Amino acid sequence: PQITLWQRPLVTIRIGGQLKEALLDTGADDTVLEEMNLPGKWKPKMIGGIGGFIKVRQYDQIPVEIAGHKAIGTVLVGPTPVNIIGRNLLTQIGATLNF
């Protein structure tokens, strides 16, 4: 696609079996999903931005599929108020910013 910015860039992705709506984001270094129970080993970490830090469980090599473009990478599960797709994964579908 060619997505416009008049509204938040919300798209469907699928994780585990979960079909979810994540926000596309060039301002996200990582991908963050809200609490969910994925099977796998993890490491905690702290991610920050406006308002400070929040703790997150970090999962490695997690297959994701962003509007029919699959990817595999790291994913942070934490108490974030929106599902966020960071450049970790945007780089893999070939998302570009164009003006």
Place this chain on the structure above:
Amino acid sequence: PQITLWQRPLVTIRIGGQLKEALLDTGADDTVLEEMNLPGKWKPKMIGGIGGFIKVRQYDQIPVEIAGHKAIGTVLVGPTPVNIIGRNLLTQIGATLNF
């Protein structure tokens, strides 16, 4: 230009005689700048990020130049880890997410 996400989407902005470095953030609704003085009356406001809420000081219809593309709008300043150009000024220069 087309920008890719291997690196942070960071660009030069002119916000009235000053050159700043800001991130083109489509995951951000508004534009938040690191604490600076901008001419005009300001209203104290409140935005939120992954970390929680922060108090900002709101400046209206302020001209910003983003890699020579002109925009005019709400521009907020407060405690942000970087300077973010939100979807409010991105739409004015017409940026879109391609993939």
Place this chain on the structure above:
Amino acid sequence: SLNXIX
């Protein structure tokens, strides 16, 4: 608003 990751 909401404003997004470091």
